[PDB]
Amino acid sequence: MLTDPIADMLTRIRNATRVYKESTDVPASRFKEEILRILAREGFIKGYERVDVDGKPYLRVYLKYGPRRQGPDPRPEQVIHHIRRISKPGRRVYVGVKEIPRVRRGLGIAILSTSKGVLTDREARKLGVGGELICEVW
Amino acid sequence: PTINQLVRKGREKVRKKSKVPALKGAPFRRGVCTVVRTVTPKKPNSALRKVAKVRLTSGYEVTAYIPGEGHNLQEHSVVLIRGGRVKDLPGVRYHIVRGVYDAAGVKDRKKSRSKYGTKKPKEA
RNA sequence: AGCUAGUUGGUGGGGUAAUGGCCCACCAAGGCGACGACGGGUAGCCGGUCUGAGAGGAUGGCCGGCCACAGGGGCACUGAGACACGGGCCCCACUCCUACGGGAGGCAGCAGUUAGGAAUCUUCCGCAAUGGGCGCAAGCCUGACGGAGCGACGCCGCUUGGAGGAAGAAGCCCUUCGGGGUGUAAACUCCUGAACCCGGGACGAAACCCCCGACGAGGGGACUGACGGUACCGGGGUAAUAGCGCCGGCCAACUCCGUGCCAGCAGCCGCGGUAAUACGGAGGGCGCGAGCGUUACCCGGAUUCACUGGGCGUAAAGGGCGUGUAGGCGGCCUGGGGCGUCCCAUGUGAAAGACCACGGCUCAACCGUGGGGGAGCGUGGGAUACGCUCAGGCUAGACGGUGGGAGAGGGUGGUGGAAUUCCCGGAGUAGCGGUGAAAUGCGCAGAUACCGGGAGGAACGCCGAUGGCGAAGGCAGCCACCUGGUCCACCCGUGACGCUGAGGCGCGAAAGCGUGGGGAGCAAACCGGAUUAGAUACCCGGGUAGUCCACGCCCUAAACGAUGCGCGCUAGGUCUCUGGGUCUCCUGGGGGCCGAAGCUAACGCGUUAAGCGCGCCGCCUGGGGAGUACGGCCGCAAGGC
RNA sequence: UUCCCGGGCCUUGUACACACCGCCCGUCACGCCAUGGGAGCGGGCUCUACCCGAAGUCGCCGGGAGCCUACGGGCAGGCGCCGAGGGUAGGGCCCGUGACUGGGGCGAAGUCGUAACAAGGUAGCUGUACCGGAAGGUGCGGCUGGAUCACCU
RNA sequence: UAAAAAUGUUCUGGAAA
């Protein structure tokens, strides 16, 4: 019955990249597309696309990695190293534009939902808005 | 614990226990010796530790330890008790401040005299 | 864990400056509570202060705001204001006077005493300044206040000297008896001059007031200093205090002698038993210095109550299991609302403190001026992604339908055979039984062994397990009836109806308890025989409760996967039970083993997670004491929670 | 080559590591400390009821009885409600005590045995139940955190 | 999985390394 559609998606992405899969499916929902659209723009994924899995609407995320490596364990490093859900249904989290976190000293992105749509920390900051803190990624 | 449980029960504060009641919050406390005896130490050790059972003003009767070599205390001497237990003497949780009230200092003490209530001697 | 009679509301009054059950009649039965009422303990609250990376934690002394009290307790008067600290009345306790009938007082004002305590100050000077009351004013009063005093109680500043001065006195200490160390340290030589001495000597003070002008504005004039002959300036001027802790590791600093588990040390680990950097002294060294240590308490370190920021298979930690109340949490599309949320403006956020810049005391401490933050909360305006709410829509969750399946799932009633025991009838004779070996025991009153018959109770061999069913406990011959769960297929219906679940309710092995029944075998207790140093055991022979049934209790466990429930996601291999198939093999549900990724302290776990995530619940916080005591609830008791 | 003594290699269990000449459990005896129960006593706080009830405000009355009068009134007085405080009785919470008693912690070299750790010499642990100087034994049931060869998958 | 095998007690207090 999925208590949290979003966390679920973040985890699908996480569980997939960890076994270096090429792409992963996820039940589709407008708000979810927004998240992906951002991870897309920001370079964490190669991109998403609306597909259809046996009658029902799913989103197909295309994962991205680094180059193969030398030494033992040539597995490439992840582009999406970390992706944690900040606000959970068990306890929401909202931040004023002045309290918006800085993820990984800059090399990280934070995603938040605002009246002005779903934007990244950087945008929200340059928009003077705050909102619910969806998740952070680096 | 899930946040909902923390909301419902919350975390519990520590609450530390005094290793030195009988002092009732004071740094020191006065008392009268009702028995100045000689007890045998805990295990690894062997000796005849000089300890006195003191009747405190704070309404407590506890045993304290008499620091230094040799003392002058006898039944009914008035002393000033202080924090500080002695590991060997089980049950002994306070020391006797040397050089206050009826507790004389330690005769011929040349080092760390301050801790044994003895005056700086005149240079011979 | 339940509390409530002025109790909760009403109507009309009394009362007050004013609302009000504030108080009073009369009427109504309410009001409050696990979102913790009622009760008990503790406590004045705040600005702030200490600590902390922060979030927090601790705290509330001095200064500022608010409240409360004025020996304990009640009360009113006067009044703009008090139910009044140096006003009043009354009672009480205690202190004192009395001509014994009634009198007097209240330092939690300043100072001082005494008691208590580890411990906390002068019965100082002045209204000169600021502030207050009264006065037209002069001015009066002001233990507010401005000052001085005492206390290293704290912070800041200063001094105990500066430069020379030996391949290096003495003394003391070591020593491989050459020497090393104290040590430029001293002495000694120059030099400066804390103190003290003489002289001068404030700022804080310009207004009230008087005079010209109208006693307005403006101008002019006079008085006034407690601190104090103090600060400060000039001149003169003497080498002029040093201590406390520590030196095994943590932790900077080592040698000799004394001591011999003694004496002693000790924050933790620990030192001491005749070569002790750990005790005591010495020499030496390190740290700090008008101080240095000690004790006490707070924060830190302690992500060791984990919001930031922890955990529960074996370390402490998953509830014995269901069902479910409150509560928490909630799939997909669309629109209204705009409570959460976010944004702008605006009001508030006192001062002091903190921070920053600059100044004033020779610096600093202190201190002034200015500057910048700021959550909260009020108001107006706006946003609508997410949460919430309303409405419409959806079918992927969930439930239902139809057709099927497996099963020691449960309850009830029957019934079948093997065996043990006892009884009866045969037949037969000297032992049987038991053990490491035996003895007790049964047996010539005929046992054991054997055949036939009967009675009775309990459990169901093979099948049969790496099996199956159940939420758990748990369930095993067979048959019938009654009944639960569950799985698959078709995808037919409903349309989020869901997940979890503090309490509650139900279930809950064995032993145990109550009434009654039943009693073959087994068997606590108990009695023998052996064994042994003993033998309340183990081994042997007996044997009661109990084991069995009914109905009612009890509610525990290594109630175990020592692994809460649900959902999604993340290689495979292999065996197996059960269903479907376009039955090489695939697909759904279940039971095992090995193992990708990942996880773990390791062992191991790994699509039956101990991996990766979300929701909800339970639980943990070093070891004993102790699942003990006390209290409460339960129980017939044992006991349980 | 079963057995006794010593010893090699592998393996298994371990709570041993001063390493089985190890470890270690419980009663009994002595000392100390804290604590529960205990005929009961002594307090503190606090609740209920009823009795006496100061001052005082607020209601009557103010008359066969005074004083004032701005002579409608007012004051002094008298009655009452409430009421500090005492008093009598009974509860509730807490504290201190008490002959005696239960168990507990701790304490260099005490007595008895040997339960556990190696099939610890009866595998161990466990709920319960009865029993026994003591550790513990036994009954029923449960767990593996117990079990050589073979042997079955 | 199924799983037989032993009559026989005990070694004062510190400190080794």
From Swiss-Prot, chain A:
SUPFAM superfamilies the record matches: Ribosomal protein S8 (SSF56047)
Top-rank taxon: Bacteria
GO CC entries: ribonucleoprotein complex; ribosome
Keyword terms, alphabetized: Ribonucleoprotein, Ribosomal protein, RNA-binding, rRNA-binding
GO MF annotation list: rRNA binding; structural constituent of ribosome
Xref: InterPro entries: Ribosomal_uS8, Ribosomal_uS8_CS, Ribosomal_uS8_sf
PROSITE patterns attached to this UniProt entry: RIBOSOMAL_S8
Function noted in UniProt: One of the primary rRNA binding proteins, it binds directly to 16S rRNA where it helps nucleate assembly of the platform of the 30S subunit central domain. The combined cluster of proteins S8, S12 and S17 appears to hold together the shoulder and platform of the 30S subunit.
Quaternary structure (record): Part of the 30S ribosomal subunit. Contacts proteins S2, S5 and S12.
Protein name per the record: Small ribosomal subunit protein uS8
Organism in which the protein naturally occurs: Thermus thermophilus (strain ATCC 27634 / DSM 579 / HB8)
From Swiss-Prot, chain B:
Entries under InterPro entries matching the protein: NA-bd_OB-fold, Ribosomal_uS12, Ribosomal_uS12_bac
GO biological process entries: translation
Basic residues bias locations: 108-119
A cellular component annotation (GO) from this entry: small ribosomal subunit
GO molecular function: rRNA binding; structural constituent of ribosome; tRNA binding
UniProt PTM comment: The methythiolated Asp-88 contacts a modifed residue of the 16S rRNA close to the decoding center, and might be important for decoding center assembly.
Keywords, sorted A to Z: Methylation, Ribonucleoprotein, Ribosomal protein, RNA-binding, rRNA-binding, tRNA-binding
Record PTM 3-methylthioaspartic acid, positions in chain: D88
Stretch list, region Disordered: 105-124
Keyword presence, Endoplasmic reticulum: no
Record-linked CDD domains: Ribosomal_S12 (cd03368)
Organism domain of life: Bacteria
Subunit-structure text: Part of the 30S ribosomal subunit. Contacts proteins S8 and S17. Interacts with IF1 in the 30S initiation complex.
Protein purpose: With S4 and S5 plays an important role in translational accuracy. Interacts with and stabilizes bases of the 16S rRNA that are involved in tRNA selection in the A site and with the mRNA backbone. Located at the interface of the 30S and 50S subunits, it traverses the body of the 30S subunit contacting proteins on the other side and probably holding the rRNA structure together. The combined cluster of proteins S8, S12 and S17 appears to hold together the shoulder and platform of the 30S subunit.
Family statement drawn from the similarity comment of this UniProt entry: Belongs to the universal ribosomal protein uS12 family.
The protein's name: Small ribosomal subunit protein uS12
Originating organism: Thermus thermophilus (strain ATCC 27634 / DSM 579 / HB8)
Gene: rpsL
